[PDB]
Design a protein around this ligand. Sequence first.
Ligand SMILES: C[C@@H](O)[C@H](N)C(=O)NS(=O)(=O)OC[C@H]1O[C@@H](n2cnc3c(N)ncnc32)[C@H](O)[C@@H]1O
Ligand SMILES: C[C@@H](O)[C@H](N)C(=O)NS(=O)(=O)OC[C@H]1O[C@@H](n2cnc3c(N)ncnc32)[C@H](O)[C@@H]1O
Ligand SMILES: [Zn+2]
Ligand SMILES: [Zn+2]
Lengths: 401, 401
Amino acid sequence: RDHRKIGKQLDLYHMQEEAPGMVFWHNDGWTIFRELEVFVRSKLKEYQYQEVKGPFMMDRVLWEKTGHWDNYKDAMFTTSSENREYCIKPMNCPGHVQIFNQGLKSYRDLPLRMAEFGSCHRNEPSGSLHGLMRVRGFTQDDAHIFCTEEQIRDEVNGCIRLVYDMYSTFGFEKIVVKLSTRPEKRIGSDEMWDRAEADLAVALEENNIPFEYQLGEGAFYGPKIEFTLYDCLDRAWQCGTVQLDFSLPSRLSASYVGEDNERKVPVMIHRAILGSMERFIGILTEEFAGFFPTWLAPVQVVIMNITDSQSEYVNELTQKLSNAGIRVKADLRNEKIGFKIREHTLRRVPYMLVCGDKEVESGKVAVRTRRGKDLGSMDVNEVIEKLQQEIRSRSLKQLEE
Amino acid sequence: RDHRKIGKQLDLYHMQEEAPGMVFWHNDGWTIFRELEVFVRSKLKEYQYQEVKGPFMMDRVLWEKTGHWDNYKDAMFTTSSENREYCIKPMNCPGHVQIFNQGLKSYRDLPLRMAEFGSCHRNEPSGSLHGLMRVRGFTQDDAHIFCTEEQIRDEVNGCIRLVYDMYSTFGFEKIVVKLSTRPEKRIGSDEMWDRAEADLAVALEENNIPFEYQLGEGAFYGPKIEFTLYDCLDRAWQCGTVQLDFSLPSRLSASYVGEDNERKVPVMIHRAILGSMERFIGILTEEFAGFFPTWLAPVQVVIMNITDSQSEYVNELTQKLSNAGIRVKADLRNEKIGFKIREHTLRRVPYMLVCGDKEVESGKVAVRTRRGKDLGSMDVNEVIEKLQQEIRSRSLKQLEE
Ligand SMILES: C[C@@H](O)[C@H](N)C(=O)NS(=O)(=O)OC[C@H]1O[C@@H](n2cnc3c(N)ncnc32)[C@H](O)[C@@H]1O
Ligand SMILES: C[C@@H](O)[C@H](N)C(=O)NS(=O)(=O)OC[C@H]1O[C@@H](n2cnc3c(N)ncnc32)[C@H](O)[C@@H]1O
Ligand SMILES: [Zn+2]
Ligand SMILES: [Zn+2]
């Protein structure tokens, strides 16, 4: 169930030697990506996350202040303009702090949850690249929560709930979790690390989450919980993650007015639920073997004619399903119906509607599924409602299965 | 009237020295950006376009092949990795051709309209930067149409119609059209330029569009129709653009199987309707002086109490409007109602619902607008239906105005 082969077969994306680890999302792959963004946005609205967009690059001075220049230099791409040096962002956190720093903040504004579908670039060693799982340019479903020390428990709990809730939609209910502790190269005192590692360990146990400690694998700025999903070859991939940061806000001069009217430095929780769109889509492609649930399917329905005689009927139904919000395409090619059906079956199109003369003068449609099931003759409005229901509920199963 | 001042007043975005010409989109500005994307996508669907996403950078060798290295060198940011040089993309076209090049193409696949909200970076001289109008990082509502020479007329006409179609939503009264011809530094033969310039002029005449020439300002790869919009100081800004390219496809080895079964090179039409999201938002901000039509307004409705006595009611109404899909916020502060109305008017919030004891008992709301108008008491569901209609129709006007 190699996602790279499936990606080619379903025309989802491609990569080239001229852009190692740089993904070209084709129309169908991009549709999946966009549906995942819609899903993430829907889930975050529930938590009142703001959504922002930060700059693609920032001055070297900024990255020196955060600690990235000294602890993350090899992974960063650099460029220049007018003798000024810039780093293309490998993370979205610094930009989020810059936004937080605009306008006086008070304890009343916390917790402040700031999300971004942030494009990150990291100069990963070429030999470590692997399909969509490890690339050089990727988009994270990122967010940073600015809060008080007393709010850490609840905010970390909120991130954890988000992970399990969102993962359950895809059928993932068996997650291997790691707590990666202080790395050799790091910022912050040992006292700070003791406190942060403890906070995360307690959060995991309070949630009855079995986890394994992982020596020296934390971020340079804080310990991290890793939510692990496996690929077809049983290789572990870090997808969701939660990190506790007591260093970056101070380094970037972030503060707020406490209730005691004194200036305080907020705590920052970093988290990505899916991880990156690229990696998560890679995992989903292998998990479903290309049979994406209807809500995620690039093309949900294909309508085919037998001969040019049903073309008009097919075009009418196509526009009708399209107006109903279904991703539909008409296949009016001069090919045998069995040839068309095989093609769309291989493309994993959830539903196929066949229209012969009988369907045209009946006003109905013959329905088939990509699993080869013959659903017989159905009413057009009936198929539309059933599809809309399957889509709205983001169901893992198709009609009658 | 200046978008930079209005942007600050509405907390839409900010810029700073560590990222010259790079926008930090705050929640409210990003909301506008996202609504424009939804709008464009609605039109892309209607006009039959695929939507893709290309990589942020590619090998400098590819940019040499396209002619960008010799004709667009100063504008490109460069970076490197493992002994190889890369250019951060200043345009989305080469990436689209790489996608087109994947999989054998037939004349039956044309015209192939490929759109992308493409993030471009150009090393614009710092002295030339201006708010959101001229930045170094921006997102184009770009697309490239691959077609046959016989399809040029219909495809260019389609782009022109799309421009006026989309622009009518905003009610622009001043749109100056320019036909920018062959520049000093260019690729392609003089005969090719003669044909391309003539094709664009004929398209403009066929659509009854008066225009003026702009000698020597075409792209290095082809002539351009420019749809010019103006800011509050009546300064001209190129927004929409349609360009005809007979050079890039060949340079990047693009081809398709013709009807005669012979290999043919497709013509490529480049076009952006809004231009860049950044520049377009700058223009809209000045055009409306911050009074964004309700569908674009960051916050569409603010519900306010008088005393904490109506807080529960206000919270219930805010949840109800939120569930109805309206961008609503509650203002429960212990501030004079006159001050609250003043503040949200400064923020250009379309509608303000005032809730005193009478409203709580009646189950209604007192409606006011940012234009200072009193719409009186209204039923909550009535307000919801009217706002949803104003939003769905992307109407330029508010209730009773
Ligand atoms: C969570 C963020 O706020 C934090 N700054 C951060 O970047 N954490 S991270 O470095 O662990 O990255 C977050 C997620 O991005 C994904 N990711 C990281 N590197 C890559 C890569 N090279 N290719 C694909 N996905 C990646 C992983 O799923 C990872 O869990
Ligand atoms: C239309 C594209 O396919 C074509 N390759 C292209 O890039 N044309 S362009 O160079 O004229 O740019 C398209 C639009 O982007 C916008 N744009 C260009 N440069 C900037 C900039 N520095 N800041 C903001 N918007 C810009 C303008 O509205 C312009 O009309
Ligand atoms: Zn982070
Ligand atoms: Zn182009």
